């Protein structure tokens, strides 16, 4: 029993972090095969960040403008190119700890684990959801850029995020592993802000199913609702609308619990209107939207308590 925010074992991503130094700037890079990926602003200086031209700044560097080290081993750079907001540094050794992997663009609402790193050295790990406004509530300090986010399926590592910066509200923005930002953000030291966020409905529901799979049913009711009447309520409360596709996704969890999705929504609609009356669900006093339905199936059991 139990239910926690749970990160993926980070042993495989750890064997791929290195330190990348250009000029006076140091950050983290990701060493897969014979390529080290890192944010391109490693070639920036504090003055440059305000209004940088990357193209211009990079033609001004050579291979040996970049220092790459793993452990105490200096890796030699023998090629470089800019991809979107990232730099691809070809080095003279292939990572022998390179795992099976791929690069995915994560969608809003999906989750991943983040291996926070400093100076190519992994400090810690936690799990965060990509928000609807394309930010994540991470915990990062200066020197954390190039830290990465990923899932692991089977033996494969799906890299979906490299950290590039922090917004004024203290949330984080970054790119997939092709350098294309998540959200309307750019790697410049200029006024930039998170858009309004909303609560991930599909997840709140997946989580209410977890409560039941964990055998707690207190927040259910006799009612049902139409999708459309659910949504007038979703909107009032700054929840994403539910769609028929999200209803199909929740069916397996509906099947394991015997609670109809639209029935569950009525549960939720009631929770939204009446509060939780000082009670907890899965030991939270709040409605939790940072667990996907895939997170619930992985963590929960195949058998419901009762």
């Amino acid at each position: 029993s139990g239910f926690r925010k749970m990160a993926f074992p980070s042993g495989k991503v750890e064997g791929c972090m290195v330190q990348v130094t250009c000029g006076t700037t140091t950050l983290n890079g990701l060493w897969l095969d014979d390529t080290v990926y890192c944010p391109r602003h490693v070639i920036c200086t504090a003055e440059d960040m305000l209004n940088p031209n990357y193209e211009d700044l990079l033609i001004r560097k050579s291979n040996h403008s970049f220092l790459v080290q793993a452990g105490n081993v200096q890796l030699r750079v023998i090629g470089h190119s800019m991809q979107n907001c990232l730099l691809r540094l070809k080095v003279d050794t292939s990572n022998p700890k390179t795992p099976k992997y791929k690069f995915v663009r994560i969608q809003p609402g999906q989750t991943f684990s983040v291996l926070a790193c400093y100076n190519g050295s992994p400090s810690g790990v936690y799990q965060c959801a990509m928000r609807p406004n394309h930010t994540i509530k991470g915990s990062f300090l200066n020197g954390s850029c190039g830290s990465v986010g990923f899932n692991i399926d089977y033996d494969c590592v799906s890299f979906c995020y490299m950290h590039h910066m922090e917004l004024p509200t203290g949330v984080h923005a970054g790119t997939d592993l092709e350098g294309k930002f998540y959200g309307p953000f750019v790697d410049i030291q200029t006024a930039q802000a998170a858009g309004t966020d909303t609560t991930i409905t599909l997840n709140v529901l997946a989580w209410l199913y977890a409560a039941v799979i964990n055998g707690d049913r207190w927040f259910l009711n006799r009612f049902t609702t139409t999708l459309n009447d659910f949504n007038l309520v979703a909107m009032k409360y700054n929840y994403e609308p539910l769609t028929q596709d999200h209803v199909d996704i929740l069916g397996p969890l509906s099947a394991q619990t015997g609670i109809a999705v639209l029935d569950m929504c009525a549960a939720l609609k009631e929770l939204l209107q009446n509060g939780m009356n000082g009670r907890t669900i899965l030991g939270s006093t709040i409605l939790e939207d940072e667990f996907t339905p895939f997170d619930v199936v992985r963590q929960c059991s195949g058998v419901t308590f009762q």
Partner: peptide, 5 residues
């Protein structure tokens, strides 16, 4: 401003 870590 945004801050690039």
């Amino acid at each position: 401003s945004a801050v690039l870590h």
